[PDB]
Write a protein that binds this ligand. Structure first.
Ligand SMILES: Cc1occc1C(=O)Nc1ccncc1
Length: 291
């Protein structure tokens, strides 16, 4: 899977909100482009002159994420964040020249991402009460990953002492994205655990935080909620469910070729962090069948 790279695998089965620190600093921003940010402005102008209803939005930028020594007390992860925008993404990660920007950032800064917007996405491995994960089918008419399978998620918008409010907005955003797209009541959802961070190499290395969320409804009840919104209550064109039993071997299935990169990152991290038992009971052959 060359289109996805793991930046972070969390310990302990995944980290809760209370164990994560953020540092939000202009030192973590994109570097101005070599020949100036006028190249971003030009792309944006061209786009607005064809689609004048489009609007910019701020986004969080991922600079880096450092894990504490495993087994330690205190905060377990430090997220280094800056600010970016949808406009800066369209002018850098989405540009035809994005690979040239990656080479120049290696030359100039020793950092392939230094000239890239790299907005932080969020995604969920969302489990039902009857042990299925939730999948969504993408419209064949959108610009990004048309017609491919996704998981719930999105790209959160801004508004350890500004840090803790930023970590709160990241965790809140993955629940809000599940309520808005799957049409689930907020009180049917567990507090999220962070599983890790995955990069999309087809989008010049932009990263997504991947979370585990448990729902108290069965697959049948989740389907009813999604569908009862009607076609205008969701951006996706369909919902479907895979038993957690069968997610273990998903990369060997014909489904794997239809998964978008950020959904592949969610399923690899689910399998490594929530799957893959370490203990004698769950690791016994009748409960963890070989192969
Ligand atoms: C990544 C991180 O975020 C906040 C603190 C740390 C960290 O590394 N903590 C630590 C270092 C050394 N011994 C024990 C714990």
């Amino acid at each position: 899977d060359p289109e996805v790279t793991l930046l972070l695998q969390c310990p302990g089965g995944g980290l809760p909100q209370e164990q994560i620190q953020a540092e939000l600093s202009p030192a973590h921003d994109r570097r101005p482009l070599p020949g100036g940010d006028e190249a971003i402005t030009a792309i944006w102008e061209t786009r607005l002159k064809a689609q004048p209803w489009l609007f910019d939005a701020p986004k969080f930028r991922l600079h880096s994420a450092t894990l504490a020594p495993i087994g330690s007390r205190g905060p377990q992860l430090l997220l280094r964040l800056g600010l970016t925008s949808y406009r800066d993404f369209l002018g850098t990660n989405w540009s035809s020249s994005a690979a040239w920007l990656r080479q120049q950032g290696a030359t100039d800064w020793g950092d392939t991402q230094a000239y890239l917007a790299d907005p932080l996405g969020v995604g969920a491995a969302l489990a039902t009460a009857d042990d299925f994960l939730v999948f969504l089918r993408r419209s064949r008419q959108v610009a990004e990953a048309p017609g491919l399978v996704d998981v719930p998620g999105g790209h959160p918008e801004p508004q350890d002492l500004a840090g803790q409010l930023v970590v709160h907005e990241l965790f809140s955003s993955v629940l809000q994205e599940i309520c808005d797209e799957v049409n689930l009541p907020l009180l049917t959802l567990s507090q999220p655990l962070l599983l890790g961070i995955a990069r999309n190499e087809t989008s010049a290395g932009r990263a997504s935080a991947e979370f585990y969320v448990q729902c108290s409804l069965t697959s049948e009840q989740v389907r009813k909620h999604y569908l009862s919104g009607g076609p205008e209550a969701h951006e996706s064109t369909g919902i479907f469910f895979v038993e957690t039993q069968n997610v273990r071997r998903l990369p060997e299935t014909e489904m794997w070729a239809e998964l978008c990169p950020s959904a592949k990152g969610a399923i690899i991290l689910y399998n490594r962090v929530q799957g893959s038992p370490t203990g004698a009971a769950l690791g016994s052959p009748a409960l963890l069948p070989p192969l």
